[PDB]
DNA sequence: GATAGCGCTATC
DNA sequence: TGATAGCGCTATC
């Protein structure tokens with residue numbers, strides 16, 4: 001994550017829905033905002049969240065009375081994506097976990113915040129011939145909000161990871177906000193190698209498999225893209241090996257394969273998956289952030305989380321627009 | 328709860 | 340295309 005000198009959200013309160021690790025909180029608080037409520041139902045996530053922020057998020061949002069939610073200016077929500085991701089069954093709203101957006105919609109109806117800040121995977125944008133994104137657009141447009149939606153790739157914002165996500169920013173219409181803009185991409189000068197831990201600390205992650213097959217020579221020059229070097233087994237998800245000179249593939253939450261949830265990398269002649277700390281770094285989390293004691297849950301947590309830096313630039317731009325009120 | 332082989336969709 | 344990559348699925352212990 002980045003240092004923010006000009007706090008654009010000072011004095012504003014926000015809600016951290018589907019909190020997970022608290023990525024949205026880190027991003028918004030770094031801009032000067034105050035979190036007044038958090039919600040997350042996974043026991044392990046609640047444990048890490050509490051370990052880092054001192055509070056336990058409230059449980060199952062589907063059974064929380066919206067009138068109970070504290071007044072706030074900004075609603076944050078990286079809602080579930082299993083139902084829309086290119087990696088899943090794409091059941092959408094018909095999935096037991098694909099209707100969470102409507103829980104957001106009904107919170108917005110009751111609390112009517114100044115801004116609604118949501119996040120989800122890239123495929124959400126095209127899922128079901130684009131009908132799902134339109135349902136969200138109309139739902140917000142009808143709750144009386146504008147709808148700014150764009151797909152940003154983390155590699156365009158200082159973080160070496162090919163994580164493409166759709167970011168949705170909605171302003172209450174009375175706040176005639178007509179100058180919101182998504183952050184402008186800039187050159188990437190940090191790569192996977194720059195974030196790795198010393199070999200002594202990751203020896204246990206090294207995998208040596210007879211069916212390891214290198215298909216491409218290691219690259220000498222850093223590039224802002226993923227570069228596959230080899231594969232293990234059939235080369236399905238989590239069986240692919242990349243160059244640390246390029247960028248990291250998308251970390252996942254339920255991912256399988258020998259290099260489950262992080263993918264494999266060629267480091268000093270050895271192939272290994274990333275350490276939870278490196279995942280934290282690949283996601284833009286500061287080293288001060290405490291990871292969960294269960295490595296598997298830690299990978300899962302960072303897996304469906306958000307890249308803090310991207311959130312920061314957007315959050316900064318949200319406050320910039322909110323603060324431009326000339327006479 | 329942790330581990331890992333998979334198998335199919337989206338993109339150009 | 341043909342090659343690549345995905346906040347996933349889920350069987351087993």
Ligand SMILES: Nc1ncnc2c1ncn2[C@@H]1O[C@H](CSCC[C@H](N)C(=O)O)[C@@H](O)[C@H]1O
Pocket residue numbers: 018019020021022023024039040041042045059060061062077078079080081100301304305306
């Ligand atoms: N009904 C429900 N109530 C509360 N949390 C829920 C929920 N259904 C799903 N979730 C939570 O939705 C989250 C989606 S992942 C969002 C990650 C988050 N922005 C971060 O930075 O970590 C998961 O952590 C999941 O446990």
